[PDB]
């Protein structure tokens, strides 16, 4: 098995398009105060400023729930539940030592082991060239996350907007778009060589205390030898991974009895679950 990684949500209908999700973005579906305080919290934060001065803090989007509408039904598809996080919140319940010890507290006294984390949430992309493969990357070995590990385009999208339930499309349509802006920055491809994405599914990273990643399909008009020139023109200083490689999507299908699987991260891995899942296995 892969204990590393679960699923919260698999998609209907090969992946949902922008105009069939729904957002809720409200202040209920934020973190619970920690029980002795959020100073717990600062305490971090100040300790990690006075050893690298030069980290700024971030808002996030948090995952709270997720709701899928009967199969085959019409309107819209999903329902996102979201709240607001940071940064500095992720490093000081997701990161901390005593993240299984905030996941049990939730557990007591929420029901909910999620109740006391930050759980931004992330995006990541199934990426398909035209001569059919994905595309993945190797990760930098002096990073503090997954360091070395193989990964694929990805980030984890920042809010700015200026009816709490009209807030929602701007929401979804900002997932939407940063999954594409992530791909022109690191893979350094043209913005109109790539599809609107897909939502294929969710999946939670337990390694970092069940923070949860969006993972979309994204298909590219370029060759993948096309892909690899435009990446590598960037030079080092416009990715971060070190290296770019391809895998025919094909044998994407069998990748969890490779010695591949080993090296991808937890993000990866959810995104190749959910690609053999929802666009493959016909």
């Known amino acids: 098995m892969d204990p590393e990684v679960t699923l919260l949500l698999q998609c209907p209908g090969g992946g949902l398009p922008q105009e069939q999700i729904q957002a809720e973005l409200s202040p209920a579906h934020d973190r619970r105060p920690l029980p002795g305080g959020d100073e717990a919290i600062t305490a971090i934060w100040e300790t990690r400023l006075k ?18 509408a009967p199969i ?5 598809q999903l329902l996102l539940r979201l ?46 060239t035209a001569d059919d493969f994905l595309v993945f990357l190797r990760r930098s070995r002096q990073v503090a ?5 193989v990964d694929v385009p990805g980030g984890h999208p920042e809010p700015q ?30 913005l109109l060589t790539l599809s609107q994405p897909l939502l294929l599914g969710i999946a939670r ?4 205390a069940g923070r949860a990643s969006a993972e979309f399909y994204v298909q590219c008009s370029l ?35 490779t010695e591949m699987w080993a090296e991808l991260c937890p993000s990866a891995k959810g ?3 959910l690609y053999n899942r929802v666009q493959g296995s016909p």
Do not use: M
Not at 56 to 64: C, N
Not at 72 to 76: E, H, V
Not at 228 to 249: D, M, N, W
């Open 161 to 190: 907007a200026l009816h709490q339930d009209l807030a929602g499309q701007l929401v979804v349509h900002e997932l939407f778009s940063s999954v594409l802006q992530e791909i022109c920055d690191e893979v350094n491809l043209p």
């Open 83 to 128: 709240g607001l996080t940071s940064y500095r919140d992720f490093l000081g319940t997701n990161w901390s030592s005593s993240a299984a010890w905030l996941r049990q507290q939730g557990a007591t006294d929420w029901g909910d082991t999620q109740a006391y984390l930050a759980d931004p949430l992330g995006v990541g992309a199934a990426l398909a």
């Open 145 to 149: 996350e997954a360091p070395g590990l």
């Open 271 to 273: 995104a190749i679950i």
């Open 205 to 208: 990273n337990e390694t970092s």
């Open 72 to 76: 085959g039904s019409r309107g819209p």
């Open 223 to 257: 060759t993948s030898e096309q892909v690899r020139k435009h990446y590598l023109s960037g030079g080092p200083e416009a990715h971060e991974s070190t290296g770019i490689f391809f895998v025919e999507t094909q044998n994407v299908r069998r990748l969890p009895e």
């Open 51 to 68: 050893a690298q001065p030069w980290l700024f803090d971030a808002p996030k989007f948090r995952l709270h729930s997720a709701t899928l």
